[model samples]
Target: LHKEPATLIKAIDGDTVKLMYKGQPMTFRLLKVDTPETKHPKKGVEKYGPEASAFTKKMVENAKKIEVEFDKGQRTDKYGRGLAYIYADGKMVNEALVRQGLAKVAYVYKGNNTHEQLLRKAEAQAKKEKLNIWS
Candidate 1:
């Protein structure tokens, strides 16, 4: 039960976003997770990169209230911003993004990592279906 709360403003990319809380501008990045960069040589931008970002933007934009669920550690990432599972309108944005195949699970730093299996399953299903994100 944190006293301070935040509202989501927008998704910056696959892993970053902006928020408003307590009259302050806040930023968040998914903890210990790195997605494929929108642009890279070998990996390049993925088919779903824009779609993922757009999906995230749609889910979170104009969200006026936010809640966070943390794992073993607190929400502070290396950049010192809150890392959290952002909830809005009874939905967990992170899991939803992955479940929809718009984003993939990222479990770096080896934290609680509960979503590894779930993400794997989701990815497998997406691949089997040859979703645009996978293709």
Candidate 2:
């Protein structure tokens, strides 16, 4: 996890957020998880997507600090969005969402990467408990 400090500018959706990194605003399509589509220029809002977005906003917006971690694979997606895990108050917001069943383990990188097992385990608990999206 290559950590970089950033400030939360906007939580666009569950998986996508805008951050101010090093005085420049950047968009991050978070790694290892995909929440429902809240706003697709074409596909539009999917069912249960707003819950994810609301959860994300509450998590990040209330945090005292924010950081992002990058993987060994691709640094960014095709749309030039940052691919990373966001940490709020030193807790991984990505994993937190999974634990609550607001997101799914998805868009994963291949090979021995960090956090793969952690995310799956969180999701398993969420599934077992039937939280949010799972319900």
Candidate 3:
């Protein structure tokens, strides 16, 4: 995994964020997690989309520091946005999102599936609890 220190500039949605990395603006799509669409032009707003976005915003805003780690296999997607796992404060933001039921585990990369099992378990728990998006 490629690890780097980054400053969160903004949370575009639940799983996408704009960050300042090495003094350059970069967009990071949270790897292994997907939240509902809040700003899709065609799909418009999905259920619990706004809550997911708000949760991510709160996480970023409360964090004292942010770090991004890109998966070793594919650093960027076809859209050119970096795929990463975000760490804020002392928590794994991606896992937190899923555990809180604001996002779901969507994609699993080949070598960088370190958090796969944990996230899947969290998702199951979320669904059982009927939390937020899961409800």
Candidate 4:
């Protein structure tokens, strides 16, 4: 995995964010995690979507620093969005999202399994705790 420094400009949703990567604006989709949809052009709003978005915003905005790590396998998604593992305040944002029940383990692409088990474990905890989306 290769890591790059980045600043979070805005959170598009729980799983997507706008980032300032190496002085250039870019979109990065969180790898191995997917949160509820706050707004989908066609699908509309999903349950617990707003809460997931809020959680991502709070965590990302509150972080002292943000970084993106590219997986050894797939680095870009089908939409051409950069796919990465995001870190904020030294914590794995993807894991935190699942641990808090704001997101779920999703879209497991090949070669990006680095945090799969850990994220799945967090999701289990969230489920057991009946937190947010898990409830």
Candidate 5:
């Protein structure tokens, strides 16, 4: 199994997390999802803010193996970290979150998306459900 037990070392806001995977520290930016910025303290929290954080934390708290798929087109963002689509239990965790209305499709650059349709569909469903800040 590619998955290994890992501990969440820190939270980089609601959408980002730092983890120790197999003793190596790794940072992950939740894919296809955009949460409210923690930087704006006074700004009203994003829709499902608590839910998003809780959901992300629950999945990464004691994860043993987090699937990391590289993005051929958009390898990394401005920070230069590898970009990937994460998965758990045979499910696309990134897309799943959007489908559940916990996030929005934030970035979609060229050649780096394998789940564009799926992600969009999920996001649309979330909108239809009035998920996120929509409510």
Candidate 6:
């Protein structure tokens, strides 16, 4: 860990979180995972969307600490928000949601997958158990 200490401004959804990072309020899109949409403009809320959002909000709000870990590719997405792995306590929120079947592993590229194996393993187990979205 080379993690940056950040404060939670809010949890936007399972895959997005707002944080007070490095002295500024910003939203960090969690990397390597995609959760159900709770606030899509046209797609509407998908199945399990509210559960995903609630899970993330609980994770962020209940944790004693939160941090951000940057990967090796894009620093910011096209939307200009920070793209990173979010850690609450010692758990990576990205991996946790996938493990719980609340999110699917996605949006990966060649250089930005330092923890891809971990996420994939979690997803595999979730699939085997037929949890949430997988069910």
Query: How much lDDT does each candidate structure score?
Result: 0.66, 0.87, 0.86, 0.87, 0.66, 0.90
Q: TM-score each candidate.
A: 0.72, 0.91, 0.91, 0.93, 0.74, 0.95
In the range 1-135, model 6's lDDT, one tens digit per residue, is 379899999888778899999999999889988888888799999999999899889999999999899998887888877889899998999999999999999956846878988999999999999999999
- On lDDT, the candidate that comes out on top is 6
Candidates in descending TM-score order: 6, 4, 2, 3, 5, 1
lDDT of 5 by residue, 1-135 (tens): 133344557655556677665588888776557765545668766557777777767765546555665555765666744455666544566786787777788766657766678888988888888876555
Model 5 residue 17 lDDT? Answer: 72
Which scores greater on TM-score, model 4 or model 5?
4
lDDT of 2: 0.87
Query: Which prediction has more favorable TM-score, 2 or 4?
Result: 4
Candidate 6 residue pairs in clash (backbone atoms < 3 Å):
none
| Tens digits of per-residue lDDT for model 2, 1-135 | 578999999988888889998899999987888798877898898877899999898999999999988877777888989888899999999999999899999845543257888999999999999998888
Q: Worst lDDT window (10 residues) for model 6?
A: 107-116
lDDT of 1 by residue, 13-121 (tens): 7767787756778787754344556766887886777777776677777465666556565567778667766666667677667666666666566364655675677
Winner on TM-score between 3 and 6 is: 6
Q: Per-candidate RMSD vs. true structure?
A: 3.4, 1.7, 1.6, 1.3, 3.4, 1.2
lDDT of 3 by residue, 1-135 (tens): 556799989888888889998899999888899899888899999998898889888998889989988766677878878888898886888999999999999866555676788899999999999998878
Error of 1 at 68 (Å): 2.4
lDDT of 4 by residue, 20-58 (tens): 998999999999888877778988899888887887888
In model 1, the runs with Cα more than 4 Å from the true position are 1-5, 32-34, 39-46, 62-65
Q: Candidate 5: which stretches are off by over 4 Å? A: 1-11, 20-23, 41-44, 62-64
Error of 6 at 109 (Å): 1.3
lDDT of 2 at 20: 98
